[PDB]
């Protein structure tokens, strides 16, 4: 239970929560905007995963201001969570290499 692994776990949990809330809130923001496609929850959940991973195929996206604000929160949550996982991996590798050198 080192700090970086704990923060990775917390980040994963928070990211899942952000995906669920982002899905629900994107549907709430986008309904009422003619032409909007991000308007049912299953595909909104798929879109939130797309957005958080940055693997944005372009099949779905928000057209409203509040839908795009929701999108930005999902983007930042995903990108920073994955950066935090990378940082935790770096810390683990650094510690293990320090032990391997006997420092």
């Amino acid at each position: 239970s080192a700090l970086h692994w704990r923060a990775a776990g917390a980040a994963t949990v928070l990211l899942v929560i952000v995906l669920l809330a982002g899905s629900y809130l994107a549907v709430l923001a986008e309904r009422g905007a003619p032409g909007a496609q991000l308007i049912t929850y299953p595909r909104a959940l798929w879109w939130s995963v797309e957005t958080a991973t940055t693997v944005a195929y372009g099949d779905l996206y928000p057209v409203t201001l509040w839908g795009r604000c929701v999108a930005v929160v999902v983007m930042v949550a995903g990108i920073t969570s994955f950066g935090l996982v990378t940082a935790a991996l770096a810390t683990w590798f650094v510690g293990r290499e320090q032990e391997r050198r006997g420092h």
Epitope: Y24, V27, R31, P34, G35
Partner: antibody, heavy 118, light 108 residues
Framework: QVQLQQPGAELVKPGASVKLSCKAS????????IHWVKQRPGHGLEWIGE????????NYNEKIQKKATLTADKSSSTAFMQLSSLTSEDSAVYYC???????????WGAGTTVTVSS | DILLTQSPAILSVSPGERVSFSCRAS??????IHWYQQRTNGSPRLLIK???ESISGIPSRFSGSGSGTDFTLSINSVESEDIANYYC?????????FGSGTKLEIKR
């Protein structure tokens, strides 16, 4: 059990208003949307609007003259549609329908026949 | 706003035959089309969701097909209880819209 309960009929004088109700039973989810659909005698189905009761936000058909105002009471699982200042063009059966946020109307109420007449 | 064209507006068929209702979307909408039956003085009843998915309690004579702009509701072996108006409805873009309906008639 019947999932959506609507009164059978409402008589409204021209110019007056009426509040239709739709009491829901069965499974209730935060993702539930309640929709309202107008059907004039011998005509098709016309979407009026929707409301998400867990948040109270309502959206309306932009193509038609706005005569409805949608509200919901979460404590009694009942959705209301206030139709305001009616003419005979507003005489119709008004259905409510429940959509689980996945785009289709899984269940419909029996419909309230609204007659606008003196 | 997506226009759903249902034509012909009336279909006449002999008992026991296969019948197909057409629904055409003004733009491509994947499989986000749902089909409802409304009998005289009745409420609409969902028959088929997402173009081809069965609904519990609906007779297996009902099926659906198509994707993009062209969709078909089919009844294998029409019988009298199938006399009704049939409506398609799209959920691909806001607002949800309905087709204008096709009436099924049986030549007995």
């Amino acid at each position: 059990q019947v999932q959506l309960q609507q009164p059978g009929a409402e008589l409204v004088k021209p110019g007056a208003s009426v509040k239709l109700s739709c009491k829901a039973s069965g499974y209730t989810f935060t993702s539930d949307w309640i929709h309202w659909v107008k059907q004039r005698p011998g005509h098709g189905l016309e979407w009026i609007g929707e409301i998400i009761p867990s948040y109270g936000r309502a959206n309306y058909n932009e193509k038609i003259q706005k005569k409805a105002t949608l509200t919901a009471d979460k404590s009694s699982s009942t959705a209301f549609m206030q139709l305001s200042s009616l003419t005979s063009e507003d005489s119709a059966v008004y259905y409510c329908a429940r959509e689980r946020g996945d785009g289709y109307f899984a269940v419909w109420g029996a419909g309230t026949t609204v007659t606008v007449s003196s | 706003d997506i226009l759903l064209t249902q034509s012909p507006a009336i279909l006449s068929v002999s008992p026991g035959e296969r019948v197909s209702f057409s629904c055409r979307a003004s733009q491509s909408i994947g499989t986000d089309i749902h089909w409802y039956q409304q009998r005289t003085n009745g409420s609409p009843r969902l028959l088929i969701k997402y173009a081809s998915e069965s609904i519990s309690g609906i007779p297996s004579r009902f099926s659906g097909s198509g994707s993009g702009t062209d969709f078909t509701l089919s009844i294998n072996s029409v019988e009298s209880e199938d006399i009704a108006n049939y409506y398609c409805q799209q959920s691909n873009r806001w607002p949800f819209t309905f087709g204008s309906g096709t009436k099924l008639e049986i030549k007995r």
